[PDB]
Design a binder for this molecule. Structure first.
Ligand code: 9KU
Ligand code: 9KU
Ligand code: MN
Ligand code: MN
Ligand code: MN
Ligand code: MN
Lengths: 177, 177
């Protein structure tokens, strides 16, 4: 599974995931499933910010803590939108809202409720994806066009198939909570 | 001059410049001219990467050292281009070359020679801008279109005028070497 991650994900995503795990005392060599989950979530967030017009989204995930809050606070001062208690993943300049992106191996509705009642913030938009092709967003507002969401859902589908071909999918799908 | 920097530059550029100065033992409150020079160089590099087609440029400046070399090494493994000895500022996916960007207050030809004989690498492309409107590149290959270079040269012109209106230009133009 470790060799699959460094093979199907770019070195920039792999390095970001390795730093996030080591910041919590986890070895990517041992918790290889969470290693892949972080890479997958990072890849989806980067594809999400490329699926609209130019400069429509500001990336917050992947940045270090100080720069991430520098971007968040700069937006709240310029646009007046409320400041989130936790770091979101994107900001929609067109819709004037923060975006939280989730990638689940289980069911898409369980992850939305778990992330909605955990974020608590009324303004932050939520958009969940899954490896089987489902997606659900806040109030059915999927932000992106059907073509940009299709390449994200197809990308997750391709990842699921490659690990299934490598007999790594069921161990990955199982270890989510 | 310190109040001008935090006013005319976004908080993301200001925070990046403050970190770069503190990594060398310099206080942005005292060396305010180098504080502005770092912000200006960062702003030009970010506008440069927005002046072509989407995904035409990869940003290397502004990243921390580990991520910057992660991007550089990933490009040298994917495209086979030679690995630079020093971190460049951008990579041109269309031209398959690294880009070094310079912003000088003096003359544009002195800065090109000083940066050419210092980089020594034959493949790295050089592109210098100035606050008065001059620009020169490697072998007259300016990479960008005249419209994208115009908004960069106009931006530097606007910066020069605001500090001149604040009686800060001549102290800034003088402290370059
Ligand atoms: O998309 C998501 O599900 C998502 N979830 C989070 C949650 C809730 C807030 C904190 N947190 C973390 O995961 C912190 O990191 C670790 C938490 C626990 C164990 C970890 C082990 C290795 C690496 C990171 C870890 N934070 C988001 O920014 C986000 O996008
Ligand atoms: O554009 C350019 O002129 C440009 N110049 C450089 C030069 C040469 C390589 C090192 N270096 C530095 O400036 C390092 O930082 C400090 C060097 C010295 C003093 C400093 C004080 C405060 C903050 C940074 C400082 N490096 C580029 O990446 C680049 O883009
Ligand atoms: Mn996140
Ligand atoms: Mn997320
Ligand atoms: Mn540089
Ligand atoms: Mn430079």
């Amino acid at each position: 599974m470790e060799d699959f991650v460094r093979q199907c994900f770019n070195p920039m995503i792999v390095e970001l995931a390795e730093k996030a795990m080591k910041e919590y005392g986890e070895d990517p060599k041992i918790e290889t499933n969470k290693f892949a989950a972080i890479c997958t979530h990072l890849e989806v967030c980067f594809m999400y910010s490329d699926g609209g017009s130019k400069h429509r989204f500001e990336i917050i995930e992947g940045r270090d803590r100080i720069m991430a809050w520098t971007v968040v606070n700069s937006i709240c001062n310029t646009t007046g939108v409320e400041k989130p208690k936790f770091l979101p993943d994107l900001y929609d300049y067109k819709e004037n809202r923060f975006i939280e992106i989730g990638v689940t191996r289980r069911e898409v509705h369980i992850y939305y409720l778990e992330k909605a009642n955990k974020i608590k913030s009324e303004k932050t938009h939520i958009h969940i994806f899954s490896f089987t092709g489902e997606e659900m967003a806040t109030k059915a507002d999927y932000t992106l066009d059907e073509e940009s969401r299709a390449r994200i859902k197809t990308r997750l589908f391709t990842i699921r198939q490659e690990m299934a071909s490598r007999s790594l999918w069921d161990s990955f799908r199982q270890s989510e909570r």
